[PDB]
Amino acid sequence: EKTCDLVGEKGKESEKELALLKRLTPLFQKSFESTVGQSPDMYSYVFRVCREAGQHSSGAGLVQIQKSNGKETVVGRFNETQIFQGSNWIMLIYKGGDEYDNHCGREQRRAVVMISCNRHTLADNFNPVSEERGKVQDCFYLFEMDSSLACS
Amino acid sequence: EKTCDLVGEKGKESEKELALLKRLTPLFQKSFESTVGQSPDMYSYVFRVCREAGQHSSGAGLVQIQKSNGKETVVGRFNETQIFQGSNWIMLIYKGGDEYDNHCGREQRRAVVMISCNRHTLADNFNPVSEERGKVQDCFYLFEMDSSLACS
Ligand SMILES: O=P(O)(O)OC[C@H]1O[C@H](O[C@@H]2[C@H](O)[C@@H](O[C@@H]3[C@H](O)[C@@H](O)O[C@H](CO)[C@H]3O)O[C@H](CO)[C@H]2O)[C@@H](O)[C@@H](O)[C@@H]1O
Ligand SMILES: O=P(O)(O)OC[C@H]1O[C@H](O[C@@H]2[C@H](O)[C@@H](O[C@@H]3[C@H](O)[C@@H](O)O[C@H](CO)[C@H]3O)O[C@H](CO)[C@H]2O)[C@@H](O)[C@@H](O)[C@@H]1O
Ligand SMILES: *[C@@H]1O[C@H](CO)[C@@H](O[C@@H]2O[C@H](CO)[C@@H](O)[C@H](O)[C@H]2NC(C)=O)[C@H](O)[C@H]1NC(C)=O
Ligand SMILES: *[C@@H]1O[C@H](CO)[C@@H](O[C@@H]2O[C@H](CO)[C@@H](O)[C@H](O)[C@H]2NC(C)=O)[C@H](O)[C@H]1NC(C)=O
Ligand SMILES: [Mn+2]
Ligand SMILES: [Mn+2]
């Protein structure tokens, strides 16, 4: 599809989530990236809101590129989106990423993005915070970003 | 004595989560309450970190008391805890609450607590933000709270 897909058959989706996706529409045409870590784990993270961020038309909402060997790993897909907000933040979650091999019980990767309110920018300061891969399940990659859209 | 239980058997639990729980130790002996809503949906929410919040020994970390009939409902149990942090926030989740009867595919209720950094207080401003009960699954109750412990 062209945009984010929420849980629930068409018509049985949360009115709250739908309204939030609409609120983030200005960000759809943007692309965000951040390179972090040192060899052999230097990565380049590419994140997009409800739009393809990879190069294989797999529906990746956020990908990780092994700088060493140009390996592209899907961290999360926008067809499995969850989104909710607090008083001055919005959390976006892309599930359905590529499966781990020797971690987290071979579960699919998932991307968690915490968008904090910042009245001075529409979108800025995207950066990978950490990766939790030491659990038997429910692992994830955490990212943060600023946006005036998360201000209520 | 009991405490928060993390996913996975002892020995294979996240050292990250284990460390976060210790960081929240000072809050274990505290109790938080907030009454919200309008009749007949007026509720009293009692929150406790890794300690019994209910008066029925159900292992509840957060309960919802219906002010009209005093009916106590478990929102989340501390034996099913998840916890992680970002730059200036910590998110705590209690799953395994009482099952919905006519919402969310009858799944168990869950509590999501967003703890924001506030260097002026150790713990304050516990506030029920909202309840997402219009999804086919993955519903939840959202709460917010301030704490110096969430400051990095
Ligand atoms: O549990 P997994 O699936 O074995 O690893 C998860 C881990 O993957 C990414 O990190 C990289 C890998 O650990 C590993 O990659 C290998 C290379 O791509 C290549 O040699 O081929 C192997 C066979 O497919 C790969 O396993 O080693 C890299 C170098 O240390 C490492 O960066 C990354 O997605 C990370 O976040 C995941 O946790
Ligand atoms: O999907 P459910 O199980 O139908 O409920 C969701 C909803 O439950 C809670 O709030 C209360 C309930 O909707 C409902 O409860 C009944 C009354 O308390 C009383 O007449 O006793 C019955 C015994 O079975 C109760 O089921 O109606 C209440 C009045 O409007 C309402 O407050 C609460 O947990 C809420 O957060 C959940 O979303
Ligand atoms: C989200 O989109 C992906 C991309 O197609 C779906 O992919 C599953 O992809 C694996 C290969 O990576 C296949 O073996 C499966 O057969 C795929 N699904 C389908 C529908 O063909 C994924 O299923 C999608 N998730 C949801 C919830 O729709
Ligand atoms: C968390 O605690 C609850 C409460 O003791 C556990 O639920 C008991 O769960 C078993 C199923 O495993 C049931 O047969 C009982 O009837 C339950 N009690 C209640 C109040 O529901 C739950 O299993 C525990 N979960 C974990 C992961 O330890
Ligand atoms: Mn790998
Ligand atoms: Mn009920």
Swiss-Prot record, chains A, B:
Name a single GO cellular component. Answer: perinuclear region of cytoplasm
Q: How does it sit in the membrane?
A: Single-pass type I membrane protein
Lumenal-side stretches of the chain, per the record, are 1-152
Give all cystine bridges in this chain.
4-50, 104-139, 117-151
Q: Indicate yes or no for the key word Zinc.
A: no
- What is any one GO biological process for this UniProt entry? protein targeting to lysosome
Give the quaternary structure.
Homodimer. Interacts with GGA1, GGA2 and GGA3.
Q: In the UniProt entry, what is the domain comment?
A: The extracellular domain is homologous to the repeating units (of approximately 147 AA) of the cation-independent mannose 6-phosphate receptor.
- Which protein are we looking at? Cation-dependent mannose-6-phosphate receptor
Q: Which organism is it from?
A: Bos taurus
List the lineage, top down.
Answer: Eukaryota, Metazoa, Chordata, Craniata, Vertebrata
Of the parent protein, the shown chain spans 31 to 182 of 279
